[PDB]
């Protein structure tokens, strides 16, 4: 019960893993351009399964997505909360743009993304608050900075334990989005298979089966 939060009991679940895998395609298809201007580009998404596209009950790519932003360098499209998103415009020269894709985050998910000022000190991108606090305390004890502590944590994180334990709380941040740079191809008619990116999405069923079957609860039973 004391160590429910340490990642030692949460990270790998080789018997019942916690994540699904989603694949995203970014493309554009130039058609009937001078050889007016057609400019459609699409963001497609699909869960890797033996499931077929025609079969109903398939999860939509937009089932687990929060925000999609596309900024050109025209006008910028933002989507707030369809298996594909298509954007068709006019113009033929070319454009390069930034795509930001944010994923839905469950409340059952127990991991918080760290800020770059933290993951520099501890080689961990994401963990519970407990892990960050334990590692920071192990760090100040390892370098004999101990109840006053003065250093690298200071210049990185930019007085006492009761002070640091909330500076770190502030350091923890909500899920950050994925950033990609994508260039529309005007002469390259089909840009379909080039940019394929794979991300992992939460599996709520595994999280629910896991948090209700914990060593603490079974031990109490």
């Amino acid at each position: 019960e004391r160590s429910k939060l340490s990642q030692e009991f949460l990270y790998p679940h080789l018997n019942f893993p916690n994540v699904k895998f989603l694949r995203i395609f970014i493309s554009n298809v130039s058609e009937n351009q001078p050889w007016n201007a057609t400019w459609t580009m699409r963001i497609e998404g699909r869960l890797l399964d033996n499931v077929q596209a025609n079969d109903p009950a398939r999860e939509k790519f937009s089932s687990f997505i929060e925000s999609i932003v596309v900024d050109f360098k025209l006008e910028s499209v933002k989507w707030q909360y369809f298996d594909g998103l298509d954007i068709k415009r006019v113009g033929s020269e070319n454009v390069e743009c930034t795509i930001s894709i944010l994923r839905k985050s469950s409340p059952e998910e127990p991991f918080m993304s760290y800020s770059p000022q933290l993951t520099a000190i501890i080689g961990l991108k994401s963990g519970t608050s407990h892990d960050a606090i334990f590692s920071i305390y192990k760090y100040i004890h390892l370098n004999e900075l101990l109840a006053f502590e003065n250093n690298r944590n200071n210049h990185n994180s930019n007085k006492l334990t009761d002070l640091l334990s909330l500076i770190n709380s502030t350091h923890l941040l909500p899920l950050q989005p994925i950033e990609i740079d994508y260039t529309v191809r005007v002469d390259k008619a089909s840009t379909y298979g080039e940019l394929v990116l794979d991300i992992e999405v939460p599996d709520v069923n595994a999280l629910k089966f896991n948090n209700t079957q914990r060593e603490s609860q079974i031990g109490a039973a």
Partner: protein
């Protein structure tokens, strides 16, 4: 390991090497893990 890497890079602070130091520090900001899930197709 993180402490020593950051230290020796701050000492290497003193073109190609500039972009490479930027790449290194960005990489240190984001280490990689393994994500494991079930296998849909055997």
């Amino acid at each position: 390991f993180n402490q020593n890497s950051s230290k020796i890079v701050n000492v290497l602070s003193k073109e190609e090497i500039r972009s490479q130091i930027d790449h290194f520090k960005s990489m240190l900001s984001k280490p990689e893990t393994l994500s494991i899930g079930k296998n849909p197709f055997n």
